[PDB]
Amino acid sequence: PVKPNYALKFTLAGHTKAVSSVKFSPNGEWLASSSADKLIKIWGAYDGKFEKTISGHKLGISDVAWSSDSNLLVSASDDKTLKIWDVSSGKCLKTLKGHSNYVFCCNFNPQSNLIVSGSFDESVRIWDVKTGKCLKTLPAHSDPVSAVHFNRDGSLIVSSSYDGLCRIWDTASGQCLKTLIDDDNPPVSFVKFSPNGKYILAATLDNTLKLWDYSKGKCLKTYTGHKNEKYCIFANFSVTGGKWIVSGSEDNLVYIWNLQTKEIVQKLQGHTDVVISTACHPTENIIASAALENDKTIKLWKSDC
Ligand SMILES: O=C(NCc1cc(Cl)cc(Cl)c1)c1cccc(Cn2ccnc2)c1
């Protein structure tokens, strides 16, 4: 497989405002979406069929994340709070209060007993799932936080911000172990670990994605061609078939790169506004995508490799 062949299979309509994020469940059954319309929705991952709507937040939602057993959800909202949800019942189990401004990004750790979050108050907080109380507050940045992610065994946390920085945090201690500085520092709009945990993928608002060896502090790969200067766009590692890099773009397209050669191998067309979020299915060659206010739709593409 030197090139994939993703083609549209389903289009998922429902949200009455801009979509903010989409995520696949670990067991591979479901797709979850958050939106500016305060709502969370669940969809069939193979058939694109609507399942249910989960409500509660008093303002818009920017992000959502699955637990490892596909039974819980955490969400980050403009009401300065996070909420933990039981997917089956639709009940709100906990309401994480702490941040003093918009909560923008969230994630479970591999063990799924902890939750990390980033906020416009320029901080990162570590929460306990069962008690719902905050364990650590990290003075991470001097600008809004754009992304937070656990590594493979949950021992590390990576974060990014509009201040231009990427930082590695020890989960147990809460100490700052590393700070990534390039030749220049444009705002970092996204970051996350690699599946093997050796690398991080970082995006900056100068239309550029990069692969970093964080321990040795050097850039290994660079990916360009798309447009990204205003929005924090998600990016993924595609591992089920060919080894690609997936990301949205401000020109209403989904870009797919060959991880090694850094070549654009496929560009997906269909949306009518900025593509803000993408995700990759855990066992099948399926990609999900979502778009902003003028579009409001979610799309499911499938490939043979
Ligand atoms: O780009 C956005 N706002 C502009 C912005 C962001 C920050 Cl952090 C700061 C400023 Cl000043 C302006 C945006 C809004 C809603 C949903 C997502 C998708 N997403 C990405 C990560 N989590 C959700 C991105």
Curated annotation (Swiss-Prot):
Outcome when changing S62F: Strongly reduced affinity for histone H3
Database matches in Gene3D superfamilies: YVTN repeat-like/Quinoprotein amine dehydrogenase
SMART domains: WD40 (SM00320)
Family: Belongs to the WD repeat WDR5/wds family.
Residues the UniProt record annotates as site (Important for interaction with histone H3): D78, F104, F234, E293
Effect annotated for changing F234W: Strongly reduced affinity for histone H3
Consequence of substituting N196A: Loss of interaction with RBBP5 and reduced ability to stimulate KMT2A methyltransferase activity in association with RBBP5 and ASH2L
Impact after mutating F104L: Strongly reduced affinity for histone H3
One GO term of the biological process aspect: positive regulation of DNA-templated transcription
Phenotype when changing F104D: Strongly reduced affinity for histone H3
Gene from which the chain derives: WDR5
GO molecular function list: histone binding; histone H3K4 methyltransferase activity; histone H3K4me1 reader activity; histone H3Q5ser reader activity
Entry-annotated residues carrying N6-acetyllysine: K83
Phenotype when changing L211K: Loss of interaction with RBBP5 and reduced ability to stimulate KMT2A methyltransferase activity in association with RBBP5 and ASH2L
Cross-link (Glycyl lysine isopeptide (Lys-Gly) (interchain with G-Cter in SUMO2)): K17
PANTHER family to which the protein is assigned, alphabetical: WD REPEAT-CONTAINING PROTEIN 5, WD40 REPEAT PROTEIN
Oligomer status and interactors: Interacts with PAXBP1; the interaction is direct and links a WDR5-containing histone methyltransferase complex to PAX7 and PAX3. Interacts with HCFC1. Component of the ATAC complex, a complex with histone acetyltransferase activity on histones H3 and H4. Component of the SET1 complex, at least composed of the catalytic subunit (SETD1A or SETD1B), WDR5, WDR82, RBBP5, ASH2L/ASH2, CXXC1/CFP1, HCFC1 and DPY30. Core component of several methyltransferase-containing complexes including MLL1/MLL, MLL2/3 (also named ASCOM complex) and MLL4/WBP7.
Function in brief: Contributes to histone modification. May position the N-terminus of histone H3 for efficient trimethylation at 'Lys-4'. As part of the MLL1/MLL complex it is involved in methylation and dimethylation at 'Lys-4' of histone H3. H3 'Lys-4' methylation represents a specific tag for epigenetic transcriptional activation. As part of the NSL complex it may be involved in acetylation of nucleosomal histone H4 on several lysine residues. May regulate osteoblasts differentiation.
KW Secreted (keyword) present: no
Name of the protein: WD repeat-containing protein 5
Location of this chain's protein in the cell: Nucleus
Keywords: Acetylation, Chromatin regulator, Host-virus interaction, Isopeptide bond, Nucleus, Repeat, Transcription, Transcription regulation, Ubl conjugation, WD repeat
Consequence of substituting E293A: Strongly reduced affinity for histone H3. No effect on interaction with KMT2A
Claim: S-adenosyl-L-methionine is one of the keywords in the record: no
Effect of Q260A: Reduced interaction with RBBP5 and reduced ability to stimulate KMT2A methyltransferase activity in association with RBBP5 and ASH2L
Lineage: Eukaryota, Metazoa, Chordata, Craniata, Vertebrata
GO CC terms in record: ATAC complex; histone acetyltransferase complex; histone methyltransferase complex; mitotic spindle; MLL1 complex; MLL1/2 complex; MLL3/4 complex; NSL complex
Pfam families: Beta-prop_WDR5 (PF25175)
Species per Swiss-Prot/TrEMBL record: Homo sapiens
